[PDB]
Design a protein around this ligand. Structure first.
Ligand SMILES: CC(C)(COP(=O)(O)OP(=O)(O)OC[C@H]1O[C@@H](n2cnc3c(N)ncnc32)[C@H](O)[C@@H]1OP(=O)(O)O)[C@@H](O)C(=O)NCCC(=O)NCCS
Ligand SMILES: CCCNC(=N)NC(=O)Nc1c(CC)cccc1CC
Ligand SMILES: [Mg+2]
Ligand SMILES: [Mg+2]
Length: 220
């Protein structure tokens, strides 16, 4: 799997297409009652992945509903994160006693559209990241992925907004050249609903088969 390369009580499951025959759980059905087919398929497939991963942690097949800010609603005692892009659906779930929060993201390994980089980055990230990332790799897309994984690990614990300028992310590369680590340092107040505040979120990145994958797993 691609997501295992960015992971260190924890389970995952991913699919690269939308298999026929999959249906949503009846509780989930109204959330895509009048949605386009592309949205319906990615919604159904990634939640099947979620249930495959939750089954590994002993959780019966349950519906994954959405909160007021779109965040996924996990069964009791479980955390996780979902992501879907062109050609990828991914789910990583964890046991809340040992895993405090999870955030993942997948994007096609392409250059960002013009003007997007300025909106998702801090000036020091645009300056230092070309020097720590391998040549030809779309470091701008990877940075955006790490921003997205950061937000998905941040929000379930804080329930507050986190802008692209509210976290400074530094990157490192493994000797293998296409994987590495990153550190997301929150610049605003990281007070959580429970537990110690969020200050530093460490994660992993990987480019493989035309996809960028990032993931953050916070230990409980
Ligand atoms: O594809 P993307 O990387 O944009 O991920 C989107 C997923 O992240 C998750 N998500 C959405 N809003 C979120 C939030 N505020 N906090 C955390 N996770 C969130 C959802 O599970 C969404 O998929 P769904 O709409 O099918 O549930
Ligand atoms: C440092 C972290 C900053 N990163 C973000 N704040 N990331 C987003 O808000 N991502 C987003 C999502 C959530 C995946 C859903 C819909 C639209 C967007 C972008 C407008
Ligand atoms: Mg998506
Ligand atoms: Mg995404």
């Amino acid at each position: 799997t691609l997501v295992a390369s960015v992971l260190p009580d924890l389970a995952y499951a991913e699919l690269y297409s939308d298999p026929p025959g999959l249906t949503p759980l009846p509780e989930e059905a109204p959330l895509i009652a009048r949605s386009v087919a592309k949205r319906r398929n990615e919604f159904i497939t990634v939640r099947h992945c979620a249930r495959i991963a939750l089954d590994q942690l002993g959780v019966p097949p349950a519906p994954i509903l959405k909160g007021d800010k779109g965040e996924p609603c996990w069964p009791d005692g479980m955390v996780g994160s979902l992501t879907h892009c062109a050609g990828y659906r991914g789910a990583v779930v964890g046991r809340r006693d040992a895993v405090r929060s999870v955030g993942i993201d997948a994007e096609p390994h392409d250059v960002l559209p013009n003007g997007v980089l300025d909106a998702i980055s801090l000036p020091a990230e645009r300056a230092d990241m070309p020097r720590t990332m391998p040549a030809a790799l779309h470091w701008d897309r990877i940075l955006f992925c790490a921003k997205e994984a950061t937000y998905k690990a941040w929000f379930p614990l804080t329930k507050r907004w986190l802008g692209f300028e509210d976290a400074h992310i530094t990157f490192e590369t493994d000797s293998t050249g296409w994987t590495g680590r990153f550190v997301s340092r929150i610049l605003i107040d990281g007070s959580t609903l429970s537990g110690p505040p969020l200050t530093t979120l460490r994660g992993r990145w990987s480019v493989e088969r035309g996809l960028v994958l990032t993931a953050i797993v916070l230990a409980g």
